[model samples]
Each structure stands twice: as C-alpha cells, then as structure tokens.
Target: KETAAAHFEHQHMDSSTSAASSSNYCNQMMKSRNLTKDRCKPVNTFVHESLADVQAVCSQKNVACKNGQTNCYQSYSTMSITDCRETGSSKYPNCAYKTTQANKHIIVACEGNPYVPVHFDASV
Candidate 1:
C-alpha cells in the first residue's frame, strides 16, 4: 500500500504514505518512458522498518545534527541520521508512522532556512 500527504511547517512540502507509489507523477513517467523494457520486472517491494536504533543514537546528550536543538530520528543508512520526530502538534499534528503501510515517505525535522525533506527509501 502507498499514500501521500502534504505538510506545512518550517518547510512547505508533501509526502505519500504509499511507497514509491506516493508520487503518481514518477510512476507514470517510468511507465510512459518504458525504461523497464522488461515488463516482467517485478514490482519494487517497499519496507519502512522502525527507527529504534536511529532514535537511540540521537537520544544521546549531544548527538544532534542539522541544528543544535534537533535530534536524529530516522534514516536510510545506519551511518547517517535524519532529523525526525513524533511531535509538533501545531505544524505537524497528524505526523505519525502508518503501521499498516508496507513503506512510507516521511518528513524529518530540520532547523534553518527553507527546511529540507529527506526520503528514506527502504524499498527492495
């Protein structure tokens, strides 16, 4: 399953709960381009694992990045951490992991001018 959502905070952006399918534009482009060439190619499998280790690393007394106040939450690779959280009711109240979805397009916390939105693609 895939889904998409829009967010407004330090940055104005949107996301899809749907794996890569979150972006209907990208899907249609890949198909119309016929880049796959092999229609037999299997559909990409998406995975959105929990960020226990990620959160653990950032929970430290001074393991923060991007901003002095932000902490690392989730990421695509183990070596690097992205700023993500479950709070901020005013700007991001509905921000929570979707348990039922196989994969997700998430928003991480960032502090600075024009915040950034990073994608943790764990799809195989």
Candidate 2:
C-alpha cells in the first residue's frame, strides 16, 4: 500500500492543476499523469489537499472499502478534490473525462505497516 501511495503521489499530488475548475481538467490530467495506459481508468480522483493532510486520513474514522475491506478510512474535514469519470464515448488515445470539483469528505483504503492510503475509495 505504501508503494501504491508513492505512485499515486507521483501521478496526482505534485501536479496540481492550474485551472482546477476547468471543464477539461481531468481530460488533461488523466493523460498527463499516464493513467491512460491499457485504456482510460474508469473512475479516479485527485485531491487538492496537501499530501500530509491526505496521509492523515489513515488515522481518521474507520470505514469499509467498497469491496468490504477493513482498511478504509474517511476524512474528518471536507477536502478539495477533482473527480475524474470517463465519458461514455471516451476511447483510447482520445480519452475524455467529466471533471467535477468539490469539497467533500473523502474515503480511502489504506495498507502497509505504517497504514498509509493506497486507493481513493470515494468522496461524500
């Protein structure tokens, strides 16, 4: 999970979008972040919240992952995030996405000895 966190950070964290509210934000990001390989990632999120703040979720309220895993947790405060959902007509090399930004409590799945976030489960 820690390794996954490292990769997620590489893809989503450092590259904070300049126009986070733009309509094409996800379309640009999903490709720039190399998430388009093998086909577009169906659903994903990029938290504008700080890395430390995101890491803190590991110690926040416990929750269950969609798959019913026990390692999930929810953030206590609403966080800035961009939701990336693949458009129905999205195609490889021409990937498209619906970008929506919101302030919401995020749920994430954590793992590893240090218990850090590995997967972004949802935002509510």
Candidate 3:
C-alpha cells in the first residue's frame, strides 16, 4: 500500500544524473510536483539520491529531530541535495525559487508500520 512515508519519498527524492543543479530546477520541480498551487512553499529540498539510500537511514544512528523528538535518525554519510527557497518577491501560482546545492549528512524522522522516514528534519 502507498503510505505517507512513500509519499514523502516521492515528494523529496530525485535521482536523475545531475539535472537538479540548474538555477531553475527548483522553480520547475516545485511547480510540476504541485507544491506551488495555493501558496508558495517557503522552503523545501530535494535529495539527489535513491530512495534506498534515504530509507536505509531509518536504521542508522538514532537522534533528535527538529522538534526535539527521538524518532529521527542521522545519516552516516553526506548526500547531495538541492535546497529550494521561495524568492523574496514570489507570489502564489507563479512561485519563484532560488536553488542551491550541497552535500550533507541528513536528519530524518522515521516512523510507520515498516519504519520508514516520513519527515525531513534537517541536514547536518
């Protein structure tokens, strides 16, 4: 069954070669992924790795989540990622974005019947 964790995987994971490094990738991705409909998502991110890599994090070292919860896990290795932030003057239905790339160890909140990551806490 498709669950929230899988949906989170769909929403955040992107494994294309190096397509996300473009200046307008965020703008294109965010719109195509349906995050720019009513209100511009102020901030979001895309991990340039396979879902397998992210899912394995669920079994990694346990850590504190952004909200101070204990269900989060910290990645043991750095992963490539794209940060998407709404432009200062972005407006709804035409949401603009500024894209930045980095490699960092991630923090993710994992929970579900099968124990999968459902929340992107942060990168460290």
TM-score winner between candidates 2 and 3: 3
Global lDDT scores for all candidate models:
0.28, 0.83, 0.84
Clashes of each: 7, 0, 0
Best by lDDT: 3
The number of the candidate with the highest TM-score is: 3
TM-scores for all predictions: 0.20, 0.89, 0.91
Estimate the overall C-alpha local distance difference test score of candidate 3. 0.84
Better of 1 and 3 by lDDT: 3
Model 2 ranges with Cα > 4 A deviation: 11-19
Model 3 per-residue lDDT tens digits across residues 1-124: 5688877876688887544657898899898777887789988888888888988999998998878789999999998888888999988878999988889888889997788889888877
What is the overall TM-score of model 1 with all chains considered together? Answer: 0.20
RMSD of each: 15.6, 2.3, 1.6
TM-score of 2: 0.89
The whole-model C-alpha lDDT of candidate 1 against the native structure comes to: 0.28
Select the stronger candidate by lDDT from 2 and 3.
3
